[PDB]
From a paper:
pmcThe protein sequence design problem is to find, given a protein backbone structure of interest, an amino acid sequence that will fold to this structure. Here we describe a deep learning based protein sequence design method, ProteinMPNN, with outstanding performance in both in silico and experimental tests. We set out to develop a deep learning based protein sequence design method broadly applicable to design of monomers, cyclic oligomers, protein nanoparticles, and protein-protein interfaces.
We demonstrate the broad utility and high accuracy of ProteinMPNN using X-ray crystallography, cryoEM and functional studies by rescuing previously failed designs, made using Rosetta or AlphaFold, of protein monomers, cyclic homo-oligomers, tetrahedral nanoparticles, and target binding proteins. Incorporation of noise during training improves sequence recovery on protein structure models, and produces sequences which more robustly encode their structures as assessed using structure prediction algorithms. In contrast, sequences encoded by noised ProteinMPNN models are more accurately decoded into 3D coordinates by AlphaFold, likely because noised models focus more on overall topological features than fine local structural details (which are blurred during noising). In protein design calculations, the models trained with larger amounts of noise have the advantage of generating sequences which more strongly map to the target structures by prediction methods (this increases frequency of designs passing prediction based filters, and may correspondingly also increase the frequency of actual folding to the desired target structure). ProteinMPNN solves sequence design problems in a small fraction of the time (1.2 sec vs 258.8 sec on a single CPU for a 100 residue protein) required for physically based approaches such as Rosetta, which carry out large scale sidechain packing calculations, achieves much higher protein sequence recovery on native backbones (52.4% vs 32.9%), and most importantly, rescues previously failed designs made using Rosetta or AlphaFold for protein monomers, assemblies, and protein-protein interfaces. As illustrated in the accompanying paper (Wicky et al.), ProteinMPNN designs also have a much higher propensity to crystallize, greatly facilitating structure determination of designed proteins.
Author numbering: 5 to 133
The structure:
Amino acid sequence: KKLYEYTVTTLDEFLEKLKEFILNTSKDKIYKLTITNPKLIKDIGKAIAKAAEIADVDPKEIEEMIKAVEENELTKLVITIEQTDDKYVIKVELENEDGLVHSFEIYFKNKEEMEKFLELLEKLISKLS
């Protein structure tokens, strides 16, 4: 069981760490990526929400995640990418200056579906100018 944490300060860093996660050979692996640049928070949060829409995640969950991404005084996005036990999950936490955190999970049935989602996220982030 391995937990890695990174502070992500550019879009290229975000793409690099998704790659590192996929290529990590551990059976049980967790990467936690922290983003504090509000412009990058919105870029990446909107990309996750769009990827979730394409993946047919619960529409009300996506609507709530967009609400969090659009909220005033956003200060932190934390993305936890987890493969452990029988679970394949991405957790999204959006935090504001007042310390209020909204959290969301996106589950996958297997490893292949999770890596396909991560590749979708990379494609969406790559389109950004």
